[PDB]
Amino acid sequence: GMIYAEILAMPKQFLPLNKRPIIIHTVEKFLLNDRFDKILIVSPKEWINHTKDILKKFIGQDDRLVVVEGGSDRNESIMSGIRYIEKEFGIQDNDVIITHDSVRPFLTHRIIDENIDAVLQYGAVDTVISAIDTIIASEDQEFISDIPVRDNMYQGQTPQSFRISKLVELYNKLSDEQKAVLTDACKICSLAGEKVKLVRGEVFNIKVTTPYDLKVANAIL
Amino acid sequence: GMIYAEILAPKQFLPLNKRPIIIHTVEKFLLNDRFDKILIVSPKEWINHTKDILKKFIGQDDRLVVVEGGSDRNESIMSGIRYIEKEFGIQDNDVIITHDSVRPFLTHRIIDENIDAVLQYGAVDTVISAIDTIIASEDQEFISDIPVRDNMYQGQTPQSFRISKLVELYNKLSDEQKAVLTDACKICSLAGEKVKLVRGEVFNIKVTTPYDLKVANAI
């Protein structure tokens, strides 16, 4: 089967990290891996041409890269990339897609490699790290309601990787209700009884959302 | 009533911008005039090293005292309380603001809101909203469940308590409960006492690993 990368993306993906947009650092990590048959960057319509520009400026010409229009939410954007793949290449039952936040530039060769190998075997993969902090619940945002049990608790990161045909089948079954939220594709799989394989992420595999995150980002780099 | 700080503390000693992390943390508390005493709770092996570091970077301060800790961290909290009990006596309104020595980035607001909250409510936890998706797994191999995270928070420190009540609640616990209990606020939670929330900060991190120390210089 084929192996696709789907990088989900002023919008934070474009902010500078050591003089180059965060998204460029992220895309570079995928380009280093020879296993990808195509690497998609999925973007809102309003930002597609700027994304294409930034790629030619910092990366240059590479046949594997394509910028594709996203959708209404994150899972729709994953599906929009899958739609492009269907139209350009067709989808075969063994094809896999490695989806990943554009603003997580620090994922490693190991994380990418483990994701592909896990998804080829299991069909659904989440990249996670052990929760460092005690998790606390509060119903009123003012007092502790109850403090749950850390019986192995993890923080989700990304990449999240799937057998394409399987994700399509499960996503189509979502009533229009579920997917007005359900921002997490691994949740889609696990809610449906699929076994989602864990791959260990890294503490430095941070999502760069806020100005403080960017401060952390430059340090990590 | 009295207001005490208890800084629970080897990673504390590692250099942050050329000063041990513990010095950064202690300085945040020295800046607040409301503390009657500021305790640094340390394993017996490291009491001398701690006093030396304090003497070098802070110098003499009547409010600072290094106290021998205990078996685990909750026992270390209790050990600091026992010191207060012997040296000063305890009145029912006295409060203690407990805090990780490896968390140097807490702020004036965090400290002051902790004190004000404990004076009113008796028990306080410093927390931030859970941003990342939280996942459980029974086998550490596959996802078991992905809970909704409206309403979930990551616990930080300080955690502050009325001293006499914490002691009373701690000793109502079973050996079994004490064995696995890691969160001091649970001592109160389990007895059906309310624990007030104070908002922490994303940068109020623990600095424990070699990697962590670099996030720290950034901050």
Q: Would you list the DSSP string of chain A?
A: --EEEEEE---GGGSEETTEEHHHHHHHHHHT-TT-SEEEEEE-GGGHHHHHHHHHHHT---TTEEEEE--SSHHHHHHHHHHHHHHHT---TT-EEEEEETT-TT--HHHHHHHHHHHHHHSEEEEEEE--SPEEE-SSSSB--B----TTEEEEEEEEEEEHHHHHHHHHHS-SSTTSS---HHHHHHHTT---EEEE--TT-----SHHHHHHHHHH-
The sign of the dihedral angle between the CA atoms of A68, A38, A116, A195 is positive
Q: What is the DSSP letter of B164?
A: H
How far A114 CA sits from the closest chain B CA (Å)? 13
Largest CA distance in chain B: 55
Nearest CA in chain A to B205: A133
Tell if the CB–CB gap between A131 and B134 is shorter than 8 Å: yes
Phi, psi of B142 (to 5 degrees): -130, 155
Tell whether residue A77 is among the known ligand binding residues: yes
Instruction: Report the Cα–Cα distance between both ends of chain B, in Å, rounded.
Output: 35
A130 contact B CB<8A: no
B140 contact A CB<8A: yes
Q: How many Å apart are CA A6 and CA A189, to the nearest integer?
A: 18
Contacts of B202 in chain A (CB under 8 A): 210, 212
Tell if the CB–CB gap between A198 and B140 is shorter than 8 Å: yes
Instruction: Enumerate the β-bridge partners of residue A65.
Output: A39
Cα separation values, A109 from A35, A43, A93, A197, Å: 12, 24, 26, 18
Best residue of A12, A126, A140, A144 to probe chain B, by most B CBs closer than 10 Å: A144
Q: Give the tokens for residue B82.
A: 């026992």
Residues 6+ apart with CB under 8 A from A119: A96, A98, A125, A161, A162, A163, A197
CA atoms within 13 A on the CB side of B76: 23
Q: Give the tokens for residue B172.
A: 């109502």
Tell whether residue A130 is among the known ligand binding residues: no
Amino acid, res. A120: L
Query: What is the CATH number assigned to the segment(s) B1-219?
Result: 3.90.550.10
Q: How many Å apart are CA B157 and CA B97, to the nearest integer?
A: 9
Helix (H, G, I), strand (E, B) or coil at B193: coil
Instruction: Report the Cα–Cα distance between both ends of chain A, in Å, rounded.
Output: 34
Helix (H, G, I), strand (E, B) or coil at B167: helix
Tell whether residue A71 is among the known ligand binding residues: yes
A157 contact B CB<8A: yes
**Torsion (CA) A207, A213, A216, A217 in degrees, nearest 10:** 50
Q: Give the tokens for residue B103.
A: 């968390």
SS3 sequence of B81-118: HHHHHHHCCCCCCCEEEEEECCCCCCCHHHHHHHHHHH
Best residue of A133, A149, A184, A212 to probe chain B, by most B CBs closer than 10 Å: A133
Breaks in chain B after residues (C–N exceeding 2.5 Å): 9
Closest CA to A37 of A114, A105, A92: A92
The answer to whether B73 touches B182, Cβ cutoff 8 Å, is yes
Tell whether residue A104 is among the known ligand binding residues: no
A211 contact B CB<8A: no
Q: What is the DSSP letter of B133?
A: P
Closest CA to A166 of A128, A105, A133, A122: A122
The sign of the dihedral angle between the CA atoms of A122, A123, A128, A131 is negative
Q: How many Å apart are CA A185 and CA B165, to the nearest integer?
A: 46
Q: How many Å apart are CA A129 and CA A140, to the nearest integer?
A: 28
How far A42 CA sits from the closest chain B CA (Å)? 21
How many CB atoms within 10 Å of residue B210?
A: 9
A181 contact B CB<8A: no
Tell if the CB–CB gap between A190 and B146 is shorter than 8 Å: yes
SS3 sequence of B9-78: CCHHHCEECCEEHHHHHHHHHHCCCCCCEEEEEECHHHHHHHHHHHHHHCCCCCCEEEEECCCCHHHHHH
Domain range summary for chain A, segments of one domain joined by +:
1-221
Stated in angstroms to one decimal place, the resolution of this structure is 1.8
A145 contact B CB<8A: yes
Closest CA to A84 of A4, A178, A167, A162: A4
Contacts of B183 in chain A (CB under 8 A): 134, 147
The answer to whether B137 touches B148, Cβ cutoff 8 Å, is no
CATH pick for A1-221 out of 3.40.50.300, 2.160.10.10, 3.30.70.330, 3.90.550.10: 3.90.550.10
Cα separation values, A174 from A100, A180, B79, B84, B133, Å: 22, 10, 55, 60, 20
Compare CB distances from A198 to B127, B142, B219 and report the shortest one's residue: B142
B152 contact A CB<8A: yes
Cis upstream peptide for B20 (omega within 30°):
no
Q: Give the tokens for residue B121.
A: 């409510």
DSSP-derived pairing of the beta strands A38-43 and A65-69: parallel
**Tokens 């596959």 label which residue?**
B142
Compare CB distances from B189 to A147, A189, A196 and report the shortest one's residue: A147
**Tokens 């030619």 label which residue?**
A56
Closest CA to A163 of A103, A218, A91, A214: A91
Between helix B47-57 and helix B21-30 the angle, nearest 10°, is 60
Helix (H, G, I), strand (E, B) or coil at B178: helix
The answer to whether B198 touches A144, Cβ cutoff 8 Å, is no
Closest CA to B158 of B99, B211, B84: B99
DSSP A152-177: TEEEEEEEEEEEHHHHHHHHHHS-SS
Contacts of A198 in chain B (CB under 8 A): 137, 140-143
Contacts of A131 in chain B (CB under 8 A): 134
**Torsion (CA) B102, B13, B9, B85 in degrees, nearest 10:** -130
Q: How many Å apart are CA A75 and CA A178, to the nearest integer?
A: 11
Q: What is the DSSP letter of B136?
A: E
Q: State CA B195 to chain mean position distance.
A: 15
Phi, psi of B151 (to 5 degrees): 75, 5
> Between A and B, how many CB-CB pairs are < 8 A?
120
Tell if the CB–CB gap between B143 and A126 is shorter than 8 Å: yes
